[PDB]
Write a protein that binds this ligand. Structure first.
Ligand SMILES: OC[C@H]1O[C@@H](O[C@H]2[C@H](O)[C@@H](O)[C@H](O[C@H]3[C@H](O)[C@@H](O)[C@H](O[C@H]4[C@H](O)[C@@H](O)[C@H](O[C@H]5[C@H](O)[C@@H](O)[C@H](O[C@H]6[C@H](O)[C@@H](O)[C@H](O[C@H]7[C@H](O)[C@@H](O)[C@H](O)O[C@@H]7CO)O[C@@H]6CO)O[C@@H]5CO[C@H]5OC[C@@H](O)[C@H](O)[C@H]5O)O[C@@H]4CO[C@H]4OC[C@@H](O)[C@H](O)[C@H]4O)O[C@@H]3CO)O[C@@H]2CO)[C@H](O)[C@@H](O)[C@@H]1O
Ligand SMILES: [Cl-]
Ligand code: NA
Length: 492
């Protein structure tokens, strides 16, 4: 039971190459959560090339998770029967997560149970999307059975396993399935998600803004998160700080450079009453914050833009216990929140119906709206769920993965949706009412699209743009990355 020391880096170092940076433009930028012409716009505008350094970063990161999980699983043979099944359960959970991410970025990817290690650059084929689902599910089922129902602050539980496995079943339900969601998968998703919702004994944090404070790492709503070391050494700190934060006035002096702004389209998703989630995600004019710049009575953003609040914990003195320096944020990276399980339950209860007007699924939906301190809905559609998921998880680097899942379910719907997100548009001044307005002054406020700063190249998003390309460097090393995927031969 020094396994625990070997399974520990599965939460931090394993994910580092991914989390270092790429996680933001890919997870949140390609969803058009937010935007900058000078910080990797191409992900927002669908102009990404095979040479893109974020693709390389992300791709190595996820496979680093895979390598380490496989090292551990193997290592559990190169070294108590309950300590061992737990260790393997953690490795395979992370391995499922890494692939479930890749599956919704590239689609086909290479399925590796065995690292080889003797061969620097193995020539392995891509495996089919359905095989990648079945691999992820094999891993999650093991983690469901072999993780415990409660654990130490920061470690995985069987509730997390069930949580993920509910999202996976929901995502497979409609994937390439000819316009309908598979009822078998919908039922599987309902039962894993309702079992978490009803039996975990867990509860949403009363205040949504609390989720995103250092002092609240591994709260009861955090089912699975990247456990970053406060002021950690390289390979084990959260380096996203300087990329997220727009000005030193919100970092207690620490160096930063973010030019990201919440997108027109993203800011428009927030209902008029939904300002607790909006505030906790982006700064907008007038927005007050008691827990940032605590020394000066709190910070009030007084600009006309939409810089990122979420992932910007404030200064080292702003209840962060001094754990804030450049490229060193003390926040965990969320992977799965209980809120996500609530919405996932809901979507799985909607199923193939137009509307959902009753049941426990709608209860856990409204339960999320309840926390945002906004009005419940008496019935919901898929479009409500999409919108609720966007505002709930804005700037948590996961809205793109969901949009890919949806695109895989209703491709023409979502292509029309991607093309009506004002992608690449921006506006001089976002001003606030008594309600958000988008435009500019000109010598008096000019409102609407006509006064947006429009992109000046072609943006016509089509099916082949959605999944990103394989990183060119890897393609050169393994030419099968250009060939059709093949069926994986599963192990029994
Ligand atoms: O035009 C009209 C219009 O204009 C408007 O204005 C615009 C303007 O036009 C536009 O130019 C502008 O653009 C900005 C942009 O918005 C901004 O974000 C960007 O900033 C960059 C910074 O300048 C730059 O310093 C920063 O550098 C960091 C790297 O990005 C980062 O990857 C790197 O990390 C290193 C790490 O440092 C190192 O420690 C590490 O070492 C490890 C080692 O690897 C281990 O092996 C070992 O174990 O441990 C070691 C550590 O212990 O390796 C990492 C990389 O792998 O860190 C650097 C900086 O780091 C530090 O050290 C070096 C010191 O010199 C430095 O001081 C110190 O910080 O990158 C920023 C952007 O980053 C990334 O994303 C963007 C992309 O382009 C980059 O390629 C990418 O790197 O700057 C530009 C401009 O310069 O926006 C303007 C508006 O704001 C007007 O407003 C309008 O009116 C006009 O009309
Ligand atoms: Cl693209
Ligand atoms: Na359009």
């Amino acid at each position: 039971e020094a396994l625990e020391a070997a399974t520990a880096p599965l939460y931090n170092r394993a994910w580092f190459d991914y989390n270092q940076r790429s996680i933001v433009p890919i997870g949140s930028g390609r969803a058009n959560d937010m935007y900058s012409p000078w910080n990797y716009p191409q992900f927002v505008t669908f102009q990404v090339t095979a040479l893109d350094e974020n693709l390389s970063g992300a791709w190595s990161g996820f496979y680093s998770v895979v390598t380490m999980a496989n090292s551990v699983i193997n290592a559990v043979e190169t070294q108590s029967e309950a300590a061992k099944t737990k260790a393997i359960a953690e490795a395979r959970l992370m391995r499922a997560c890494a692939y479930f991410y890749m599956l919704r970025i590239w689609g086909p990817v290479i399925l590796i149970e065995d690292n080889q290690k003797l061969v620097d650059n193995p020539v392995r084929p891509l495996n089919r999307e359905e095989d990648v689902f079945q691999f992820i599910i094999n891993d999650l089922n093991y983690a469901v059975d072999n993780l415990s129902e409660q654990s130490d602050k920061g470690r995985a539980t069987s509730w997390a396993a069930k949580g993920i496995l509910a999202k996976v079943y929901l995502a497979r339900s409609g994937w390439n399935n000819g316009g309908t969601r598979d009822e078998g998968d919908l039922e599987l998703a309902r039962q894993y998600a309702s079992d978490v919702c009803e039996n975990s004994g867990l509860d949403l944090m009363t205040n949504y803004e609390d989720l995103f404070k250092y002092k609240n790492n591994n709260n009861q709503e955090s089912l699975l998160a990247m456990q970053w070391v406060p002021l950690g050494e390289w390979y084990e700190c959260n380096t996203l700080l300087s990329d997220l934060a727009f000005s030193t006035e919100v970092t207690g002096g620490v160096n930063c450079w973010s030019s990201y702004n919440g997108s027109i389209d993203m800011l428009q998703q927030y209902e008029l009453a939904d300002t607790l989630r909006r505030n906790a995600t982006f700064f907008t004019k007038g927005s007050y914050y008691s827990y940032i710049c605590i020394k000066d009575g709190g910070y009030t953003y007084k600009g006309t833009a939409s810089p990122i609040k979420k992932g910007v914990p404030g200064g080292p003195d702003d209840d962060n216990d001094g754990k804030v320096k450049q490229m060193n944020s003390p926040l965990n990276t969320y992977i799965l929140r209980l809120a996500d399980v609530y919405l996932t339950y809901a979507e799985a209860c909607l199923g193939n119906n137009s509307t959902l007007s009753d049941g426990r699924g709608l209860y856990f939906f409204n339960r999320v709206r309840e926390r945002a301190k906004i009005n419940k809905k008496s019935s919901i559609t898929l479009d409500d769920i999409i919108r609720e998921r966007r505002v709930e998880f804005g700037m948590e680097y996961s809205n793109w993965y969901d949009m890919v899942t949806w695109f895989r379910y209703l491709p023409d719907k979502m292509l029309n949706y991607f093309n009506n997100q004002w992608r690449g548009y921006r506006t001089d001044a976002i001003i606030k009412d008594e309600k958000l307005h988008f435009g500019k002054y000109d010598t008096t406020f000019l409102e609407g699209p006509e006064y947006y700063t429009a992109p000046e190249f072609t943006i016509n998003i089509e099916a082949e743009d959605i999944f990103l390309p394989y990183p060119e460097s890897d393609v050169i090393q393994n030419p099968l990355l250009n060939e059709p995927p093949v069926p994986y031969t599963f192990n029994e």
